[PDB]
Structures are given as C-alpha cells and as structure tokens.
Symmetry: D2
Subunit: 447 residues, 4 copies
C-alpha cells in the first residue's frame, strides 16, 4: 500500500502514540484481517460525509438540532431485521417531535453499523477470565473459550455493519420514514401511555401541523423519506485504520476519510492529547465527537478544540457533555465560555446517560429516568442563561419493550428489572421512555 | 347572434320570466350596451370555472371549506389598487387561519369584479328622487341628475370588473399571497389587538406549523401563491345575459357559462321558482349560490335543490343561510334534513350579515359583532348536532380601518360610527374585526 | 397630487420637452381623462416588473432569449377573446421551439394591453381629413366624424388593456400554456405545412425531448403554465404619465414605475435626446426598449445607453435593430463594438419588420417573408462573427389565417393579398408564417 | 422455526424436488450455515419488491423498458468499491441513452449482490480436481485445497452481497446517479470513441433534451438520483431458502418473499417443471425471470407461464430469450404468439450473450460484438413484425477497460484477448462496447 502525500509523515506519527482500551491478540493475524479490510466496500461514501459536515455546520450555527442514539453496544446476535427496524422507528418517531419542538431541521445520527467495541469494563473480571469487550473483540459467553480475543471478529463486525446500513438505507427509502406514518405511531404512544395526558397537548399540535401541510397542497417530495446517518466510538486501532480511504473532492481536492461511519467519536477513556485517537481524529476529514466528563477543565476543552478543529470549520467538532444531573450546571458554563471565546463554533451535545450510571442494589446496573431528564434540563438552563445554542442530545435506547431504566411513565422500579434485560452493556431507554424523553426535550426547546 | 342548440328553446323561455329588482331605463339603448358586451373578453374562462366546480365538490363532501366575502357593494370610486389590495390581504389573512383551524383546504371566493348591482333599497326614496341601486345602474349623489338610470354604467362596470380581476391575478402571482408573509401580518394583528391575548394560543400554534414546514425542507411550490376566485349577485338581466359564452369541454362536450364571474349567486328578493334568475341559473353551468331567509320552508329548499342541481352533482349548489342569531338554530335543521334526505350534497354556507341588520338609533344602520358571531356559533351547533358539514361562510368586510359594525376587540359603540363610514350599502367588518372573526370561526371548526 | 421627492425637479423638466407624434385635442378635457386614470388599478404591478428586470438581466448576460411580438396596432374591435387566444397560442407555440433551439429560457413579451397608439402615418391624409392614429386617439372609419381626436379614447384603451391582461393571466394559469398541448399543436403545423418536411427534423427532436422529460418522472410544476409579459410603444404623453405609480421595494426603497405595461419601448420617431420620451424613460424604473434605424451612428447609440442605463444595470436597456436585410450587416457591428466597449450589457434585439415595409404594387403595403428572415439571418451572422449574444427578436404577427406578408410556405403572392387583410397598420405574419419563422430562428440559434 | 400457514404443505413438496447444479458438501454443516442466514438482515425489503412488481407491470404493458446486467460471476476478490462504481456508472450511462431512445422509463436491474453461484462448467475438470462453481461454493485457484466445496462461503457471499447493495444505495443517493453528470461522461465516450461519429447524432440530441429541461425551469427532484434494483440466478438451494422471509402487505395481507434480491431468475439448466427451482419460484412473491434456449417449444413456454404466473399478474414473469443471432428470428415468434394468446403479459427480454459463446481458437472463450448486436436486432425485428413489445435486454458487462469480446469500435481481434482478461466465467462487454451497445439499441427502439 503506497503513501498518500504529506499525510504519511503525520500518519506514521499517529500510529506511534499509545492507544488505551486496545485488545490483546495475535499481531500477524490482526494485520491480515486489516489488509483484508483495506480493500472492501466502505460502509459510507465521501459525498455523504460532506453532506453531514454541511448539515452539522448548520447545527453549530443555531439553525439545526442533532439527534444521536441507539444501542449502547450492538451485538451480532441482536443485529437483526426486527431489532434494527424498531431502533430506526423510535429514532425517527423522536425526530419528528424534536423537529416540531425545536422549529428546526433535526439531523438523525445513529449508534449503528460499527458500535461493537466497548471500553467501560474494568481490565480483568472475577473468576480470572477476560470480561466482555464487544462482539468485535470477544463473545458474551462466560467461558475462557469465548472471551479469548479474536481478530476475525473485525471482519464479522464489518459484515454486520454493512448489513445494518444496507437495511437502514432500504428502510428509509421504502417508507418506514414516512412522516404521516410516524406521527400515527406517536398518537398510539400518547393514547396508550400512562402520562400521555401531559403530552397530548403537543400531540394534537403536531397533528394539526401535519393536516395543515396537506391542506396547503404541499407536494410530498421531502415527506416520504429521511436520512439516518451513522456513528460509533472509534475505539479499535486496527479496525478504524483499515477503513481509511482517500477521496478527491470537487476540483481534484484530495482528502482522507474513515468510512467505517459518517461520524466517528472519541470516548472518555481514549481521550489523551498525545494518544492515538485524538491524533487519528484530527487527521481524518470526518466530523468528530468527543466525550467530556466532570474532570474536564475549560483549559483542556480549548486545547482539544484547537487540535481537532484547526481551521475553525463550524460543526467539525461536537463536544458531548456527560456530567451527571448535579454537576452539569456547575462544570459546563466555564467550558462553553472559554470555547466560544476561542472562536470555535462546536456543537454542544448532551449525553445524559454515561453520567448517571449507578449499581441498582439488585445485581444489575441502571439509570433513573427523572435524573436523565434533569441533566438535559440543566443542559438547556445553562444554554438559555449563557445565550448559546443547545446543539443536540446523545441518548442510549432500544425499540424493544425492555426494563433497564427506572422511572418513566411505566413506573419501573427495582423489582421490575429482571423481567426483561437484554443489553450487552449500559442500560437503554424503553421504547415508551425514549418517546417520552423526546416530548419533554421538545417542551424545553420551546421555552 | 345564432342559436346554440336545444338551449335556445330553454333560453327564450328563461327571458319570458319576470325579473324583480330590475332597472328602469331605455331599452333600445340597453340592447346596444348588451350587444357590445356580447363580444368583449370575459372576466373569467371556462377551465377556471371547471376547477372551481371540482374544488366545490370537495367542500360539499366534507373535504374543504369555503371563504366568501368582500365589499357589500363595490363602487367605481372605491375600485382602486390600495383598496383591492387590502380586501385581498384580509381575505387571505383570514384564509390561512381557517385553513389551519378546519384542517382542510380553504377555497377563497370574493365579492369583487361585478358586485355593483344592489337590491336592498326600497323602491322609491324620500324627496321623490330614485335611491342608490349600485354604480352599475346609477350614482351615489343625492341629485336627480346622478340617480337617473344609465345603461352605459354596464360597460363602466365591465371595465372596472376586468380591472379588478386583472389586479387580483397579478397580486396573487406577485406574492401578496405568500403564506409566510400573511402570517407575519397576522402576528402584527394579534400583538396589536386588545383581545389578542385570547387568540395568541392559535397564533403561536400556526407559527409553529409554518416553522415545522420549513424544518421538514418542504419545497415552496404551493406556498408562494393562492387562487382567489370571484363572485357577485347575478341581479341584472342585461348584464348577465351579455356575459353568456359557449365553451366546449374535453372530448368536444359543449356547455353554456356566464363568465361575468366564476360563481354567481341568487338573492333573497329575486328568488322565485318561475322568475328569471332561478331559471337563468339552472341553464348556466357555473356553480351557484342561493340566499335563504327565515321564511324558507324545507319543502321549498328541496324544490330549489331539484331545479338548480338536476343531476345531483355535489358542490353545484351552495345554500346560504342568512337567518339572524336567534332564528338560525330553529329554522335551519329542518331544511338540512329534508335536503340531505333528497340526495343533494350542497354546500351549507352561513351568511351572518344580512340577517342581523338593524337601524342603530343614530341615523346609520349597523350590525353588532357579538350577534354576527352568534349566528355562526349556532350554524355550527346545528351541524355538530345533526352530523352534517359546515361548508363555509359569507361575510361582508373591508381592509380599511372603518367603524361600521359595533362591538369587536376595538369596543366600537354608537358614538364611534360617524368617525369613518365609507360603505355604499350594508355595514362591513373592520380589518381588525374580520381577522378576529376568522380566529373565532377557527376555534369552532376545531371543536 | 403631491410630489414624490427629488423626482419632481426631474419630472417637471421631463414634461417641458417637446414630444413628437402627439394628438391634437382639448387640453382641459384630456387633463380630466388623465386625473381619472391617475387613480385606477394598474395593468401590472411593481413586483412583476422587478421579476422582468431580473429575467432581462439574464438575457443581457447570454443566459436567456427574448421573444417579443403580437399585433402592430391593437384595435378595440379586434380585442376579443378568440383573437387574444390565437396571439397568445402562436406566441407560446413559437416560444417552445425557440426555447429548444436556443437551449435557454425564452422570456415571452407581447405587443398587447396598450399597443393602440400609432405614429407611422404621415401627418395629414388625402381628402383633407386626419388619418388613423390608433384607437386610443381616433377611429378607423374614413369620415371627419370618426377621425376627430378624442381624449375619452384613453379610458377606452385602459379598459381594453385591463381586459386583455386579465385574459392572458387567466389563459396562462388555465393551461393554454401547457407545454405538451403546445407541441401537439406544433405537430399539427409541421404535418399540415407545405415546407414541413424541412422542419420535421426539429419537430421529432422536440417530441423526443418531451417524452424524455416524462420518462425521467419529472414533476410538472413548471410545465403546465408560462409567464407572458406585456409591452407597447410609450407614444402618448397623457396616457403614460397618468399610469405613473410609486412603489416601495424591499427595505423601504422607493421607486417610480409606469404600470401601463411591464416593459415600455421608444420608437424611431420620438427618439430625441432632449425630447419627452427618452427623458420620461430614463426617469421610470421599468425595463426599456429603443428602436434603432440605419441612420444611427455608434456615437449616438452610446449616448442613448449612457442616459437610459446610467447605472450599468444589465438588461435595463434593450436595443432594437430594425435596419433592412441589406443594411443590417453593414450598420450594426460598429454600434455593438462601441456599446459593448462603453461597459453596457444591453439586450440586442432584431426587428426584421419595420425595416422591410414596401408598397406592394397592389394598393396594399407588405413585407416579403424571405427578406424578413434574411435580416435575422444577418443579425446572427453579425453576433456569431463579433462573438456577442443575440438577445431576442421583435416580430409582428397574428393568430388568424390572414394574407398580409408575401412568400412563406403558403406561397402568398401579390394576387393573394385582398383575400384577407385585417391589419389596422403594418402587415403581420400569418399563423403559418409565424411558426415557420420560429423554426428557422431556432436553426440559427443552434449553429 | 414454525410454519407459515398453507404454504408449509407446498414448501415441503418444493424441497422434495431434485435440484440440478447443486454443490456437494457436508449437510450438517450446511444446515448450520442456513440456520445462521435465517436470522440476518435481508439484502432487500418487501416494499421495494412491491415497487419493482408495479414498475415491471408497466414494462409488460408497453409503458417501460428493462435494463438488466453486470458481471457474469461476481468474485469476492472483485467485489470492491472501484469495480462496483464502474459497473453502476456504465449501467446508468447506458440507461440514460435507452431512456431517451425508448421514450419510456428504463428500469435498472443489476447482476450484483448475489451473482456468485455459477452452473455453466461441465461436472468435472481436467486433472481430476473439481472446476470453479463460483465464490459461493469454491475458489478460483487450481488446487484441490481451494476447489473443495465449502458451506461457509454462503456466509461470505451474504457478507459481500450486503456490502455491495449498501454501496449502490449510497452511490445512488450520493449523486453518481446525477443525470447531467452521466451525460457529461457519455460525451467523453462519443468524443473519444473511434466510431463515435456515427453516435454523435444521438449524443447532441440527448444534450439538447437536457438543456431544454433546464431551460424549462424544471425542478431537479427526480434528476439527481436513480433506483438500481438487484438480481441474481437463484441457483443454490440452501442459500435461497435461508433468505425466505414472511412480509405482511397493506391490510394485513401475508406473503412470502426471497429477499436475497429484488428479482430472482431461473437458468437454462435448472429449468425442470417438477424440479426445485420452478416450484420454488412459483411459491415466492418476487418478480421472476426464466432463461429460454432454442430447444424451447411454444407448448412448454405456455406451461411455464401458467405455473410461474398463475394469476395473470402482468410483469410477474420475465421471459429471457437467449437463442443465438441465427436462431432468434426463427424460434421466438411461435413462442410469443402462443404466450400472448394464453393471456399472459410477460416481459420479453433479450439475452444476446449466453447464445453466442464460442471458443476463440486461442484457449479463451469469447463472443463477437457484431453477432451480439444481431441477436437484439432480430429480437426487435420479431417484435416490430408481430406487433408486441420489446421489454428489455440482459447483457453481461464490466466497467473496466478489458478485452474479452471481439469487434466493437475498439477493433478487438483474437490477438488482443490475453492483454487483459479478468472474468471468472463468461466474457463481458468492455466499457466502450457496453455504451456502444446501448446507442445501437436506442436506434432500434426509435425505428
Ligand atoms: N425529509 C425531511 C422530513 C422528514 C421525513 N421523515 C422524517 C422523520 C422525522 C423527521 C423529519 C422527517 C427530514 O428529513 O427532515
Ligand atoms: N396554495 C395553497 C397554500 C396557500 C398559499 N397562500 C395561501 C393563503 C391562504 C391560505 C392558503 C394559502 C392554497 O391556496 O391553499
Ligand atoms: N414554465 C416554463 C416552461 C413552459 C411552460 N409553458 C411554456 C411555453 C413555452 C415555453 C416554455 C414553457 C417557462 O415558462 O419557460
Ligand atoms: N429518477 C429518474 C431520472 C434519472 C435520474 N438518473 C438517471 C440515470 C439514468 C436514467 C434515468 C435517470 C429515473 O430513475 O428514471
Ligand atoms: Mn453506553
Ligand atoms: Mn350586503
Ligand atoms: Mn408595426
Ligand atoms: Mn454469463
């Protein structure tokens, strides 16, 4: 494989860096897997990434909203036609309500087609066997057989990735992204929800807006379909470097993209300034997210922003606040002020999930719904008060009727958790609770 | 002028009938005026009349609403670019609010381009001189000079008619019928109205529906312009018979239209079954209205419906209830039941104007706003209860800030009337009071 | 009537100038006619004039073509629904063929709604009576009764003007401007033309382009209707000054328009630099044409261009070459070179009509078809060679099957002329010969 | 896996049948591969198959054309982003020319995402090792190691299938299916082709039709993108039965689809009436093709049509004539007459490839371009003469500059073949020769 140009100087340097949360496995074998994946069809194409950069610039400048979400960890087992549908459906069903509430174009990103690699686990498990690190590295089975790290799982992940994107592209053009269809499903929610009497205000109001549209004779070019972009945490060195492709923009302008997804994002753990991922990200032309915890100082946030967005292109960087309901109001404002002052129009995104994960006195780990909302509530209160733009959210959900998060309209308590708990990692929002979340965030976008 | 076909047998018979409310003037002179007008360009064309019949069929079958209105009597003096604009603007500004409220296509008919002839006056005035009978017959001046009946005023009316339609067609294609522009004017009303705090519920709600439209990327083909159809009372024999033209529909299918307007309507006074107008109307292929008072018996309403709609074409006949706020609930239901049972899908239209005209203990004649609303309120209460469709309304308004009707948000009382009173005949709704009327009728269409 | 602003200084000065080709009539009476017409609805509105300026800028910059034409002189007698249709139809039927040939948007201007005033006649007739000077001044009858100059004919002209524009606006929205309909009529021409075997190349080719359009599933938003703008020679002082209106553009920017038409043009006779019309034209914000004969020197053409286009707004001025088939190649190139060099992007338009008018040894006056074509042929040869843009043409035609011009596919000779000759002034192209002209000009636009 | 309903009775019976051209491999292993593939995301979805049935009905009824084609056998090695692009590009580049020529919607089907299984080889090779039977069964390497039959290759094929469809869906929405872009590439062909002077007639003509489109202001909703459907020969029992899914149409109407592709087709070898494939095909709701050789008798063609299209749904069956240039005119007409008479509106498709395969006196096997054209030439001559509709073609091509077929504009002779020959099986058309084929078939569609 020959060199690009002046990137090779930078690329070699980028490999040199340490990478946290890597898998331990055979190197000679993993290099073969990579050189296989160096020639496959990509999951996405450069023009679609450009389209997302342009749409993400509008989010950065107050003209659009960002809905990101899906499974915490995709599993090969769960990557099926019925499950993918339900995630797409709930993502869209939310997006119609946020579109109305925000009075702006919602951009739909998804945790899909790549979100396999997982860091959150401690380095070793009880019983002396390695713990689950995603179906791209090892199996969920609690046996030394399955938990052994396997480079071949990278090809299985690429397979399952291209399967899922092929399906969302089909599902979206085939009209599960029909606007009238989605709102008819949202009435079925509000009618059959316990706390739907609260939300029926906005339900009727969206109903009216749609009937008004048809009354004005508005030709349904844009109403039959959507665009669901895709994303995952760029965790794994060999997989993400294998998906590097070299596109040539208009007038022969050459660039370097990671086409494993439209948008890649960096996690809390692999966040070092002189580590692989932040240097990888700054080299690739994709839009980029970056998770940010309470331990962030505004000094560091400006440092990230300078490296990841070195040309002040609005929407290139998303900064994903995940801080807990209590510490969001306190920590965030200083970060924004410093970042905005430095001349960077980033997308401010709320992740009210990975802040509020607590062990539920029941074996299982959960998040309380009321606390999840309260982090977003505070995320807006900071933006309203400072006079900056709430760019988006980054929730974790599923389209199955599962009981993993407490509270909500359903009244899910400690005792309800073992009844159905299908998640490979962090606890996801119930279908009921995902829609319910959107309606509340809509109300916050209005006021 | 040669004969059409089997129509000539019927046409001769139609002339034979007596016509009420005619002008007394020279016959030889008036026949020359007619034979001049027999060759001019028509005010409208057959294909547009067909378009209205098709759209009026949708009103008859519950799928659309009918907004009709404008000046009571157009005057040559008042037929000016600024006045016509303001009437068009308020007609459209209403139509956007009714469209939202009804959740259906509003069809916009106007009292314009022909509404000159006037019957309401008693046959002779005080002082022994003839009274005003519209600028198509005589002048407003109180002198035996001006009040003399003049056949030449028919050509002056045709001139002023083609002037006004030429302007609405231009105004509508030029973008005074822009949907975003109209609602921006409606916010200026609700902000600057006294009782706008009541209406700001629906104002924000329409605002949201429009921002939602732009958020969904909806291409503005249908949003920049409208269609304002035109109408007048077919009062005058010589003028309406001069505008008879013979069109040939698809596959050479020949028909006879009165192209003085898109839709002609019959008044309370010239309503006889064996009089000129009802026989004229049944011969012409235009859509047709018919005014109906408290003295109507359901027996007669079915007789009209049989003659005017002899082929059960839905939307061909409109039946215009004008009965007073008190007698609307009582008289109407029996008429609908009999008409619906006879197998006629007419358009049920409310005229809350020509029922409630009372002399205002001030010289001038007025209508009270609260009473006008209450006739429409009852018009809906009858339809809601019977389970039939409220097809439309037929208000009289102007786009000038005039004080002719009492009540409203403005608090217009007896003493306010002489301050500005520009109407040639019946008292019209203030700009403020026309918009205010629409918002209330919207609220009635929802519930 | 109060003053505009700094225009009044200029307006007074503009009146002061002598005006050629005026009518002699009562001044006190003509001032009443003018003060009547000062308050009527205009024939057009400012936003439509702005739209034309923007579209005419595209013609000036090589991106569009200009089709102007219609009757030489409209007559009140001829201003009828059937005649107007046929002129509109042939104007559009031409425009589809020119659109294809030019591979650009054709802009459709018409000699309609105002083209009554006529200058071409000598000042006095034989028999001592005044000669015909258009239905806006006097009648066609050869009697001292009718030929007397009548200010009231200005109001009759305004009436007939608003009649005709009301009809074209209706005819155009009602779908006589349907693109598939027009080409089906053009096949009927080519099939039934004698020389149609020459033109059937381009006929099939346009047929293919339309079927291709429907094959590509192209939504028919733009295909059902057109925009026919309107024009006349601004000849008559009192009529054109009566139609002056004051519009306020975006952000309250005030301007002065003559809304008797969209585009006014100046004739050969009333062309003086310090005469009324050139000073009138430079004061009004309308787009402007100017007729130009062989006697023009490039020195003068630059002088006109400086006065009429004082801000170098492209498309504001059209320069209408009418020079004869022989003298077009010789006279024109020097005019273009000087005008282009001076920094003026005007529209170069060919008028192959008013150059080639000769008395036909038969009483009547005619133009030979082959000579008419040859002036356009040379008009293109000049532009092809110089490398400038042929902006448009300015033919005179009618949609009746009349025999006024010699030659063509029909083989019209001297003896054929009295069979049907309906023109009030210059000889117009036959329906057959108008379409035939377009096909040839299309072939010239390709090569 | 539970039963559908009354299908299970029929499904069991369908398995019972013998299947020709199957692979010999471990059954227990191959059943695991199948039960894995029973739960994956499908390559396509039911609504898209319905869309194709509706579009294929229009082809059957003379309103549309069918362009099918691509690689003869896809190889995992060749299934790459650059190769897939070039095939898509040439498929579309052809489709624009056929769309114009046919004056109808071309429907674009592709040999992609599944076309791995191959029957054409004799049962055993020289050297005693098994011969190549497609990357879904074994490898191209000439070693007993690689040629061993491997059930795991079914999962590798599904992986590579979902990879490729994910890419065409992306490539098509991203604007490699832009109509103006494709024709700009077609001018580069005609300019740089040797025999392009023949084709420049239609090249300019398509250029004109596109400029005309932009001149008419036609909004580019439909012009930026296309729909490329997908197909392969349903050869392999375990793979096709694994992709059976159960969809529920509008109003809960249940059906059974094979979602390995949009359209499956049956080969010459596996064509028996009581064999697996014809009974499989008749059970699945997909549209269906069927290859047909010279040995077909009209008696049999009606028998097929009765079984495969048991409800006379037009466009459900495609009948693919592959007969050789000589025997096409002779054999075909009798088949059509009998089929049309039986009341079946099938799609008549020409496969001018698998008839004319001859060994090229050079080791390699080839087809002559002039002979390939002549089979289509005769295919049309039969339809023109009989007065039936030429529904489509089924060529085999690639977007690489390869030398596998003789003749064409390039002048490829025997000596040119080894220079570049990349095909795993039958010889494909050069990029130059694929475009050139389309232009000629366009000319045949006109006359
Ligand atoms: N195409 C528009 C409108 C739309 C269609 N389906 C949607 C579903 C959700 C939100 C918006 C939409 C958009 O993507 O915004
Ligand atoms: N053209 C649509 C929408 C529209 C445009 N302008 C309007 C003004 C009022 C109501 C609706 C409209 C209609 O006539 O209904
Ligand atoms: N609306 C487009 C296309 C069109 C419709 N009717 C036409 C008649 C002639 C030429 C073009 C057209 C235009 O005005 O150009
Ligand atoms: N969308 C239309 C037009 C079109 C777009 N791209 C194309 C490429 C080829 C042929 C047609 C098209 C179609 O599929 O037919
Ligand atoms: Mn998580
Ligand atoms: Mn009245
Ligand atoms: Mn002339
Ligand atoms: Mn083959």
């Amino acid at each position: 494989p020959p060199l690009p140009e002046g990137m090779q100087q930078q690329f070699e340097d980028t490999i040199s860096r340490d990478a946290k949360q890597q898998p331990t496995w055979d190197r000679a074998q993993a290099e073969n897997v990579r050189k296989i994946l160096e020639s496959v069809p990509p999951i996405v194409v450069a023009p679609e990434v450009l389209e997302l950069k342009q749409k993400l610039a509008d989010v950065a400048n107050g003209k659009a909203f960002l809905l990101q979400g899906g499974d915490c960890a995709e599993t090969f087992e769960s990557n099926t036609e019925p499950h993918i549908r339900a995630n797409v459906k709930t993502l869209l069903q939310m997006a119609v309500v946020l579109t109305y509430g925000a009075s702006t174009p919602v951009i739909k990103m998804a945790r899909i087609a790549g979100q396999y690699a997982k860091p959150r686990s401690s380095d070793l498990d009880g019983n002396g066997l390695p713990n689950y690190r995603g179906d791209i590295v090892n199996g969920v089975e609690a046996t030394p057989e399955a938990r052994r790290h396997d480079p071949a799982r990278m090809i299985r992940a690429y397979a399952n990735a291209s399967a899922a994107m092929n399906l969302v592209r089909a599902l979206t053009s085939s009209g599960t992204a029909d606007l009238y269809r989605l709102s008819e499903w949202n009435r079925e929610f509000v009618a059959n929800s316990p706390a739907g009497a609260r939300y029926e205000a906005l339900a009727r109001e969206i109903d009216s807006g749609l009937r008004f549209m048809e009354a004005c004779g508005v030709s349904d070019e844009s109403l039959r379909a959507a665009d669901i972009y895709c994303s995952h945490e760029a965790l794994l060195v060999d997989y993400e470097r294998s998906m590097l492709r070299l596109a040539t923009d208009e007038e022969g302008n050459e660039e370097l993209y990671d086409l494993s997804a439209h948008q890649l994002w960096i996690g809390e753990r692999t966040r070092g300034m002189d580590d692989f991922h932040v240097n990888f990200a700054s080299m690739i032309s994709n839009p980029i997210g970056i998770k940010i915890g309470p331990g962030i100082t505004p000094e560091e946030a400006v440092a990230y922003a300078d490296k990841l967005d070195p040309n002040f292109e609005p929407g290139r960087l998303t900064i994903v606040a995940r801080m807990g309901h209590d510490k969001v109001r306190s920590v965030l404002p200083g970060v924004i002020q410093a970042v905005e002052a430095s001349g960077h129009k980033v997308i401010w995104q709320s992740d009210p999930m990975h802040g509020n994960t607590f062990t539920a006195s029941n074996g299982y780990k959960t998040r309380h719904f009321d606390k999840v909302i309260d982090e977003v509530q505070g995320f807006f209160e900071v933006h309203r008060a400072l006079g900056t733009h709430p760019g988006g959210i980054h929730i974790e959900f599923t389209g199955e009727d599962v009981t993993e998060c407490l509270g909500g309209a359903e009244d899910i308590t400690d005792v309800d958790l073992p009844g159905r708990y299908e998640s490979a990692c962090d606890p996801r929002l119930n279908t009921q609770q995902s829609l319910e979340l959107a309606f509340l965030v809509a109300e916050m976008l209005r006021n």
